[PDB]
């Protein structure tokens with residue numbers, strides 16, 4: 153009938169009836185093929201497209217309280233007709249909106265889903281050139297940033313048609329620091345972007361060899377070739393790291409951008425695919441303080457912040473790592489708050505997710521969730537989410553990962 | 566052919582060829598039916614038993630460097646013969662040892678598996694009364710404790726035969742604090758043992774209504790009825806919590822037992838089942854400091870330790886929880902060290918697991934691992950394990966969970 157789910161903290165039980173609407177032991181795999189929707193060089197076979205199309209249309213119309221039956225049956229018809237004549241179909245603006253929030257709502261790895269319904273949608277389905285793509289992206293960044301009071305938004309570019317005419321942002325995220333190697337062997341900046349940074353250079357980008365050099369937007373439009381554009385500095389707002397007690401913190405010269413916008417995901421809805429549709433929320437402290445700043449494959453500042461705190465950085469058992477990282481997190485949080493830039497700590501984040509999750513079950517008997525992702529990189533069991541049992545399942549609409557575009561691309565020149 | 570596994574920190578890749586020897590999306594489920602081996606009231610059907618028996622015998626003999634072919638073929642015969650005559654068979658002591666270490670080695674949720682080969686085995690297959698069971702358990706506790714220098718060990722009781730003659734320790738762990746309700750509504754001691762504590766009372770136990778009252782051993786032998794025995798206080802060694810800087814820590818009057826011994830798991834080997842075989846390792850700081858001491862469904866001391874540290878325990882964004890829990894962990898570690906009682910911090914734990922894991926892959930192309938379990942309840946991404954991808958799979962031998970014995974038990978009186 154369904155599946156019981158226990159919350160080992162409050163002891164409460166839940167019944168997941170929603171997992172039945174899924175699709176089709178890989179525990180800690182980052183990019184499983186099950187979560188990726190790759191390239192195709194032929195349209196989406198009519199027999200496949202039509203059913204998904206109807207389902208989605210029945211979902212949309214089956215969502216409002218005062219159900220408009222006429223419009224529903226009518227739309228269904230107009231839809232199938234459009235499919236019979238052109239092949240693929242076009243969603244109403246209202247539908248696309250509904251599609252983008254559901255896809256978010258249905259994102260197993262997102263902690264900030266309580267906000268699902270509060271999203272801004274930028275309809276860029278008219279776009280046709282990289283230059284126009286770049287202009288929309290700027291409008292996005294400018295809107296989302298809002299002088300620190302971050303606003304969630306998504307810009308939808310033209311849906312995949314035949315397959316050779318895909319719109320694709322080659323970047324992982326909109327704003328993202330560059331990572332250069334160095335003569336003395338040491339890596340500089342974000343070591344994770346080493347590969348993509350090189351690529352930007354190959355595409356004729358001028359590497360200002362620094363620690364926080366905002367990478368260039370590498371845009372591809374209508375299956376064309378990738379054109380490079382530098383993000384207008386006036387658009388990239390950044391916060392300067394500063395500890396509320398350690399005056400030596402600013403001496404670390406750290407800072408991070410305020411905009412967390414995922415750029416390379418595909419939106420799947422009603423059997424239609426949107427290879428390019430960047431979106432953004434706002435940061436959760438631990439993302440910067442723990443991942444970005446502390447990971448040994450990123451800025452890796454833990455040992456540096458350690459000794460300056462005067463700790464036995466050579467005795468693991470002293471828990472210096474535990475103390476240090478926490479002070480970094482304090483810095484990140486303090487700084488975003490001080491410089492009036494929206495941000496949320498992970499504890500608060502979790503409590504809001506738990507609240508969210510309840511609403512999801514009451515409202516629709518389920519809520520897809522990846523525990524491995526949903527639990528904060530620090531102070532795990534201290535947050536409620538650690539204790540919540542949860543089922544992970546790919547519903548629809550959905551935001552899938554895509555194969556890295558440079559790997560598969562018919563190059564023009 | 567196999568499965569690539571990436572370690573997102575060192576970037577290194579691994580090939581898991583071992584998952585092929587497994588048996589047969591449930592992400593964060595604690596007690597999945599896939600990990601439980603329940604009751605049965607009929608022997609283990611010969612056609613099932615014989616194949617598993619041979620496999621195991623081929624495993625055992627296929628483990629030594631200087632392979633003794635004669636003894637091998639010979640054993641195989643003697644084995645099948647014993648099966649044809651009696652039904653179930655008896656493992657050689659050497660085999661049982663090999664069986665208990667492999668089962669450990671094959672434990673997906675154990676962080677301390679680098680020690681797998683270093684285990685003490687107590688052969689209590691001769692046991693036949695609760696009184697004798699209790700005596701062996703004491704020998705165990707006494708051996709393992711070793712005046713603070715903890716030693717890993719396991720005591721194997723008689724294997725399941727027909728099913729109505731099962732040997733079973735009703736406790737979750739050997740040493741374990743009691744949890745009583747209270748007139749004023751407040752819970753006292755370990756709130757997790759509320760159920761089992763009551764049971765002990767029903768079985769005529771004298772509840773000394775305290776915070777750290779070591780529960781009674783509830784033993785069941787040869788399908789008999791559960792008899793209660795109090796653990797001799799001289800046997801239960803405990804450490805007194807004490808912070809190396811905050812003199813007010815001891816004023817908290819906290820303490821914890823040094824022996825972490827899992828009591829209720831079933832050992833499966835060569836198709837034979839051992840419903841009772843408690844084992845023990847030594848603690849990993851976070852287990853006590855974070856789980857036992859901080860969980861809102863245990864001792865829950867986080868807020869108490871908070872205000873005494875002088876923190877804004879009413880402003881979540883202050884990260885007081887992060888600071889507090891860490892100091893508790895410092896206390897737990899400091900105290901076990903000071904009172905000369907073996908213990909290992911989680912950071913050190915992780916590095917040793919990573920080392921372990923390498924050996925496992927090089928030595929046998931695989932290593933079953935539950936990331937959700939293997940990653941520390943605090944400072945997740947700070948430890949290497951967080952970044953390691955890993956496959957979870959039930960091999961054999963194996964330590965399965967069992968259905969709670971009180972739920973399914975043909976009561977005599």
Ligand code: HEM
Nearest residue numbers: 256259261262263264267304306431432433434435436551
């Ligand atoms: C409003 C505040 C939001 C917060 C606090 C939030 C927070 C997070 C966090 C912590 C993650 C994991 C990030 C990582 O470790 O890489 C995440 C992932 C994700 N979020 Fe949300 N998010 C927000 C808004 C959004 C919005 C508006 C969308 C989309 C419309 C979204 C879609 C997703 C997706 C698809 C992932 C997974 C990304 C991946 O697989 O790498 N998020 N978010």
Ligand code: HEM
Nearest residue numbers: 669672674675676677680717719844845846847848849964
């Ligand atoms: C020598 C030191 C050892 C350490 C540091 C260690 C540590 C751990 C930790 C941290 C867990 C998770 C505990 C929890 O959250 O409940 C665990 C689980 C486990 N360990 Fe090990 N362990 C050790 C020895 C052993 C031995 C000797 C065996 C068995 C022969 C063993 C069998 C297991 C099993 C079956 C689990 C899973 C228990 C469950 O599912 O609740 N451990 N151990």
Ligand SMILES: C[C@H](O)[C@H](O)[C@@H]1CNc2nc(N)[nH]c(=O)c2N1
Nearest residue numbers: 160538539540541593594937938
């Ligand atoms: C729901 C979730 O699986 C559960 O609360 C967890 C997660 N991982 C764990 N990890 C360890 N070490 N111990 C546990 O009890 C749990 N429980």
Ligand SMILES: C[C@H](O)[C@H](O)[C@@H]1CNc2nc(N)[nH]c(=O)c2N1
Nearest residue numbers: 180181524525573951952953954
């Ligand atoms: C191997 C493991 O899945 C990986 O390193 C993880 C785990 N969970 C995560 N959780 C978040 N939030 N972000 C991540 O990148 C990861 N990566």
Ligand SMILES: O=[N+]([O-])c1ccc2cn[nH]c2c1
Nearest residue numbers: 412414432433434435436439
């Ligand atoms: O907008 N997002 O997709 C997104 C992704 C990751 C994080 C982390 N903090 N905030 C985020 C928002």
Ligand SMILES: O=[N+]([O-])c1ccc2cn[nH]c2c1
Nearest residue numbers: 825827845846847848849852
């Ligand atoms: O012996 N064990 O099965 C076991 C189980 C859990 C823990 C936690 N620290 N040490 C342990 C040993």
